[PDB]
Design an enzyme around this catalytic site. Structure first.
Site, PDB file in Angstrom:
ATOM      1  N   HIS A 193     -12.883   1.939   5.012  1.00  0.00           N
ATOM      2  CA  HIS A 193     -11.809   2.758   5.547  1.00  0.00           C
ATOM      3  C   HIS A 193     -12.006   3.251   6.861  1.00  0.00           C
ATOM      4  O   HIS A 193     -11.893   2.245   7.570  1.00  0.00           O
ATOM      5  CB  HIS A 193     -11.777   3.888   4.383  1.00  0.00           C
ATOM      6  CG  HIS A 193     -10.332   4.580   4.634  1.00  0.00           C
ATOM      7  ND1 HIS A 193     -10.302   6.427   5.130  1.00  0.00           N
ATOM      8  CD2 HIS A 193      -9.073   4.675   4.664  1.00  0.00           C
ATOM      9  CE1 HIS A 193      -9.147   6.565   5.190  1.00  0.00           C
ATOM     10  NE2 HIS A 193      -8.464   5.635   5.013  1.00  0.00           N
ATOM     11  N   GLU A 245      -9.098   1.545  -1.563  1.00  0.00           N
ATOM     12  CA  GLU A 245      -9.065   1.696   0.077  1.00  0.00           C
ATOM     13  C   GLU A 245     -10.543   2.020   0.580  1.00  0.00           C
ATOM     14  O   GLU A 245     -10.795   3.245   0.991  1.00  0.00           O
ATOM     15  CB  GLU A 245      -7.958   2.611   0.453  1.00  0.00           C
ATOM     16  CG  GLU A 245      -7.818   2.209   2.119  1.00  0.00           C
ATOM     17  CD  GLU A 245      -6.628   3.006   2.678  1.00  0.00           C
ATOM     18  OE1 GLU A 245      -6.147   4.085   1.877  1.00  0.00           O
ATOM     19  OE2 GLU A 245      -6.119   3.034   3.778  1.00  0.00           O
ATOM     20  N   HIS A 302       0.773  -1.293  -0.036  1.00  0.00           N
ATOM     21  CA  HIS A 302      -0.028  -0.025   0.067  1.00  0.00           C
ATOM     22  C   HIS A 302       0.917   1.099  -0.158  1.00  0.00           C
ATOM     23  O   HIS A 302       1.759   1.428   0.784  1.00  0.00           O
ATOM     24  CB  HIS A 302      -0.932   0.048   1.178  1.00  0.00           C
ATOM     25  CG  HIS A 302      -2.099   0.989   0.973  1.00  0.00           C
ATOM     26  ND1 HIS A 302      -3.195   0.617   0.739  1.00  0.00           N
ATOM     27  CD2 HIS A 302      -2.115   2.236   1.359  1.00  0.00           C
ATOM     28  CE1 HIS A 302      -4.166   1.771   0.650  1.00  0.00           C
ATOM     29  NE2 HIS A 302      -3.529   2.720   1.055  1.00  0.00           N
ATOM     30  N   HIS A 333      -8.020  -1.718   7.730  1.00  0.00           N
ATOM     31  CA  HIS A 333      -9.149  -0.750   8.330  1.00  0.00           C
ATOM     32  C   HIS A 333     -10.374  -1.363   8.786  1.00  0.00           C
ATOM     33  O   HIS A 333     -11.233  -0.478   9.062  1.00  0.00           O
ATOM     34  CB  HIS A 333      -9.323   0.248   7.181  1.00  0.00           C
ATOM     35  CG  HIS A 333      -8.036   1.196   7.061  1.00  0.00           C
ATOM     36  ND1 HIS A 333      -8.016   2.407   7.668  1.00  0.00           N
ATOM     37  CD2 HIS A 333      -6.802   1.127   6.135  1.00  0.00           C
ATOM     38  CE1 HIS A 333      -6.763   3.045   7.362  1.00  0.00           C
ATOM     39  NE2 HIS A 333      -6.132   2.300   6.558  1.00  0.00           N
ATOM     40  N   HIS A 340      -1.941  -3.240   4.788  1.00  0.00           N
ATOM     41  CA  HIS A 340      -1.156  -2.377   5.642  1.00  0.00           C
ATOM     42  C   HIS A 340      -1.610  -2.555   7.068  1.00  0.00           C
ATOM     43  O   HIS A 340      -2.560  -1.667   7.456  1.00  0.00           O
ATOM     44  CB  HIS A 340      -1.089  -0.836   5.080  1.00  0.00           C
ATOM     45  CG  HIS A 340      -2.281  -0.102   4.908  1.00  0.00           C
ATOM     46  ND1 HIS A 340      -3.138  -0.471   3.993  1.00  0.00           N
ATOM     47  CD2 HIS A 340      -2.697   0.982   5.635  1.00  0.00           C
ATOM     48  CE1 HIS A 340      -4.151   0.300   3.893  1.00  0.00           C
ATOM     49  NE2 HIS A 340      -3.927   1.231   4.903  1.00  0.00           N
ATOM     50  N   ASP A 391       0.077   5.554  -1.015  1.00  0.00           N
ATOM     51  CA  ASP A 391      -0.820   6.410  -1.396  1.00  0.00           C
ATOM     52  C   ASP A 391      -0.313   7.705  -1.953  1.00  0.00           C
ATOM     53  O   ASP A 391      -0.814   8.897  -2.107  1.00  0.00           O
ATOM     54  CB  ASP A 391      -1.452   7.242  -0.129  1.00  0.00           C
ATOM     55  CG  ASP A 391      -2.616   6.078   0.201  1.00  0.00           C
ATOM     56  OD1 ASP A 391      -2.504   5.355   1.622  1.00  0.00           O
ATOM     57  OD2 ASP A 391      -3.676   5.936  -0.507  1.00  0.00           O
ATOM     58  N   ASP A 413       2.459   1.656   3.811  1.00  0.00           N
ATOM     59  CA  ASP A 413       1.544   2.862   3.963  1.00  0.00           C
ATOM     60  C   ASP A 413       2.584   4.272   3.635  1.00  0.00           C
ATOM     61  O   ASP A 413       1.849   5.225   4.333  1.00  0.00           O
ATOM     62  CB  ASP A 413       0.680   2.785   5.266  1.00  0.00           C
ATOM     63  CG  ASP A 413      -0.463   3.724   5.322  1.00  0.00           C
ATOM     64  OD1 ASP A 413      -1.134   3.837   4.388  1.00  0.00           O
ATOM     65  OD2 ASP A 413      -0.927   4.140   6.510  1.00  0.00           O
TER      66      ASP A 413
HETATM   67 NI    NI Z   1      -4.167   4.653   1.938  1.00  0.00          NI
HETATM   68 NI    NI Z   2      -4.879   3.212   5.000  1.00  0.00          NI
END
Ligand code: NI
Ligand code: NI
Ligand SMILES: [Cl-]
Ligand SMILES: [Cl-]
Ligand code: NI
Ligand code: NI
Lengths: 381, 381
Positions: free
Chosen positions: A158, A131, A20, A200, A221, A22, A291
């Protein structure tokens, strides 16, 4: 150093596949998905923990790029849910444009074979995940189209409950794990060949999903609960069910999830979490899920994507065998994606019926009678 | 008959590619996109002008399946526009599921080469188009993702004005042809390799698009204005600009567009419209765009998809040469898709910049200052 050359050799033998990152949402924040004439910045970013130069420097073999959009906050719930679907297509679009504009660095991959062929060529194998199931706007049809666009895993939640499952960080609980819809979606995710991601999600939602899923799942993650108690971390109960499921827990670099005091977190803590899971459920069920760019600051020794060789060297230093280190790097997450594809091919090959949406009636009974009468006139010719 | 065997031979030599069929929306009306255990009905439909048995019987070589959804009618314009995007993904999903569940009849195609390879195998080459730019919900990112899902043409409007162009059947006019956004979208459609479709658009919107487009366009289902005056038909002015553009007008079987009294319409009228265009702008710019399942009833002699051999025989009967009949059947629409792909490869190969959406700022100046400060701390290590 002989341990650094061992780490560098390993990084070239097998791909280190991160679970993961972002960086696509940082492009949304900084550039607003307008990367035209921004190569200099994309190679050397003024913000964040990821850019194309540091991505090369860390010798990363593959990456699941997150196509995350935030949970909807609109008072009108219909607009917020539908807005999340449009934002998802914007994030998938900028991920595809990022890969296509830098074909020497990044190459798109959607399978075990495509990861390897990308790694042979010297490219970072670029995969995609979403996500949260808030991103599909209650549409299983949309989810199948996201799979067709290259999405290969789906985080069930999430930091918000949806119609399918409960998030970890939100109270009170809505469904108490998975909803009745969520249970049906697990079958559909297994059928289509979409990898289930349990990061999550609440502890009860994990327990249910791990028992119900016919394919192996991941934690893209998340970290270990025993070493550091947090709602986002994985309990010893769910680690045992992950072993039976044949899944992989990809360890997170979030400082909150590694220690009680965030500023005390380090590379050594990440190695402790990998070794804990590898000792108790075996090293074939542990991965790396940084992450990066989902946090402002990383641990000491893992400040950005250039620091992956330090993690590989650190694992070898503690006495984790080369074969086990290779498993943690990428071989495990490749196997899960391979098994997710084989389970899908079996279920599709046995003609299992797909999950259809709750669609409204568009024609009244008057329209249907005109159409049937019209058909019989054509039959009489 | 020697003319029927000539028509049957031609249908086997080259694919007859129809420009527009709304059978996917009939599946939405009748089955509500739930085709599980409905093979018997899909092969022999109780309604409409299309099913898989009659599709074989008519010897159709290829088909652009319409992924149409209606123009939004909600008082809240944001919800209606976003709802159209979700409905579009539902219609694309059922088209893909229809093709995948019947691989002996239908095979997916997204290019000139894929049409031929599908036709060699004895399959109906199944392509996709959307009937209106209301379907993208003002998102050029979404449009690029629709291209990735297999959409190969875009009708600029349906029976409603949008932010990009004017529809034919709606008054008063909003933009007076294309909007300023519409003009920019033409460049982006040419760049991505999306075929422009000018059916359902106003006469002024056609005139502008034909002069501005760098690739050849189509009329997926429209007829000739001189023979029958209607807002949906193509004028002699726009037919001349279609010749310069190198496009193809695919003649419609709608009874309203062929004659003044609808019940007087026939196969002979469709042949008159093909011959008119073929005589004045050449037979390399005329096609077949039935609009089957976009109407309750068809003309006498073209009642359903099994009647294509009568059209091919009818053209040969009037004295249209074999080479010209083959062009009208499919060679022309293949050429346009081939030229649309070559123009896209040239413009992408010359690094032309893509059209980006109007995205909102998500981070305030406080967040950006934390991120830049954080980056410089990492630089000082
Ligand atoms: Ni993320
Ligand atoms: Ni996350
Ligand atoms: Cl942040
Ligand atoms: Cl109808
Ligand atoms: Ni239509
Ligand atoms: Ni139409």
């Amino acid at each position: 150093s002989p341990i650094e050359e061992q780490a560098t050799r390993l990084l070239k033998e097998v791909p280190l596949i991160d679970g993961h990152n972002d960086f696509p949402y940082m492009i949304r924040g900084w550039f607003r998905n307008d990367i035209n004439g921004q190569d200099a910045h994309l190679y050397d970013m003024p913000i964040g923990q990821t850019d194309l130069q540091r991505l090369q420097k860390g010798l990363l073999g593959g990456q699941f790029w997150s196509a995350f959009v935030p949970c909807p906050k609109n008072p009108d719930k219909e607009v917020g849910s539908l807005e999340a679907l449009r934002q998802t297509l914007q994030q998938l679009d900028v991920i595809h444009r990022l890969i296509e504009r830098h074909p020497t660095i990044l190459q798109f991959a959607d399978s075990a074979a495509s990861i390897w062929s990308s790694f042979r060529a010297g490219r970072v194998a670029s995969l995609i995940g979403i996500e949260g199931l808030h991103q599909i706007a209650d549409s299983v049809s949309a989810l199948r189209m996201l799979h067709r666009l290259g999405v290969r895993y789906v985080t069930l939640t999430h930091n918000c409950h949806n119609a399918f499952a409960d998030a970890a960080t939100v109270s009170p609980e809505l469904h108490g794990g998975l909803s009745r819809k969520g249970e049906r979606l697990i079958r559909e995710l297994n059928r289509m060949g979409m990898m289930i991601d349990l990061s999550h999600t609440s502890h009860e939602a994990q327990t249910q999903a791990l028992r119900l899923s016919r394919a192996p799942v991941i934690y893209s993650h998340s970290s270990i609960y025993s070493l550091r108690a947090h709602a986002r971390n994985v309990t010893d109960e769910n680690l045992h069910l992950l072993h039976r499921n044949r899944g992989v827990v990809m360890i997170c670099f979030l400082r909150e999830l590694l220690a009680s005091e965030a500023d005390q977190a380090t590379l050594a803590h990440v190695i402790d979490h990998i070794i804990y899971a590898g000792t108790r459920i075996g090293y074939e069920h542990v991965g790396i899920g940084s992450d990066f760019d989902g946090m402002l600051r990383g641990p000491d020794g893992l400040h950005d994507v250039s620091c992956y060789p330090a993690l590989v060297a650190g694992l070898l230093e503690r006495g984790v065998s080369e074969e086990d280190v290779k498993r943690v790097m990428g071989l495990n997450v490749i196997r899960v994606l391979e098994e997710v594809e084989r389970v899908a091919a079996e279920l599709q090959g046995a003609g299992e019926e797909c999950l259809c949406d709750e669609l409204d009636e568009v024609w009244n009974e008057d329209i249907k009678e005109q159409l049937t009468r019209e058909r019989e006139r054509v039959r009489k010719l």
